[PDB]
């Protein structure tokens, strides 16, 4: 996260760290959506251009964390993966369209002050909140700048950007399964996700029921926090039918 701030303790209890077993390394962010399911970006697990294709046994998820590097004894929970599910139409060849994946844990994780699931949006909440100018919150342990690493979880609030501006900022083909967020150059304030933040959640707090909803997944960006560029997020509600299908079938 670039130009963010340290998270408060328990501020993002759905935050998950995807962790490589060997060598031991942060891979990506992710989010907890129930006691046995974690949501992330497909490109965190599968990206052939970079020879990336992780199997269940390659990874762990670490839940309830604050410190990036410490083993947080008595606080974090480390879970093994039963199975990975990547969207069948994830477009890694072109533009990361449908950049979404689910991971089922071997055992349910116990909730605590530090570990708690985020909500997934219904049609109505999505329609109400996903509007240009409305701000969401992005969190992660990724790089602090384009060209180091944070001591603890970082947070930044960013406004959703109008679709024509998103499209005009890039040569990449944008789809209905993506949205973009970030400040414009003349807006003064800044901030963005960066390498390492991939797969983490873009959340908004509903003013109707005071619950947090995950509207996006950190997907891609050209550089980090560059003027006139924006971060792109997987549109979680647009893909909710696949999410529900996976959980219904394999839950």
């Amino acid at each position: 996260i670039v130009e963010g701030s340290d998270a408060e303790i328990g501020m993002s209890p759905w935050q998950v760290m995807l962790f490589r077993k060997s060598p031991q390394e942060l891979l990506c962010g992710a989010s907890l959506i129930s006691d046995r399911w974690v949501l992330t970006a497909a490109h965190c697990l599968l990206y052939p251009p970079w020879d990336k294709n992780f199997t269940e046994n390659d990874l762990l998820v670490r839940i309830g964390k604050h410190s990036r590097t410490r083993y947080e004894r008595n606080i974090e929970k480390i879970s093994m993966l039963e199975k990975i599910y990547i969207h069948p139409r994830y477009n890694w060849r072109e533009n990361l369209d449908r950049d979404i994946a689910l991971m089922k844990l071997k055992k349910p994780v116990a909730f605590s002050d530090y570990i708690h699931p985020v909500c997934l949006p219904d049609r109505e909440t999505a329609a109400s909140l996903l509007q240009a100018g409305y701000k969401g919150r992005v969190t992660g342990w990724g790089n602090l700048k384009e060209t180091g690493q944070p001591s603890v979880l970082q947070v930044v609030n960013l406004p959703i950007v109008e679709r024509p501006v998103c499209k005009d900022s890039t040569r990449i083909r944008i789809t209905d399964n993506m949205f973009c967020a970030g400040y414009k150059p003349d807006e003064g304030k800044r901030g963005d996700a960066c390498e390492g933040d991939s797969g983490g959640p873009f959340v908004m707090k509903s003013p109707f029921n005071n619950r947090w909803y995950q509207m996006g997944i950190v997907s891609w960006g050209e550089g980090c926090d560059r003027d006139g560029k924006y971060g792109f997020y997987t549109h979680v509600f647009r893909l909710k039918k696949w999410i529900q299908k996976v959980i219904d079938q394999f839950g």
Binding site: E25, T69, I78
Partner: peptide, 11 residues
């Protein structure tokens, strides 16, 4: 750079 995690999780 990461603190070693308990070996139980690597089994």
């Amino acid at each position: 750079d990461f603190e070693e995690i308990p070996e139980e999780y690597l089994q």
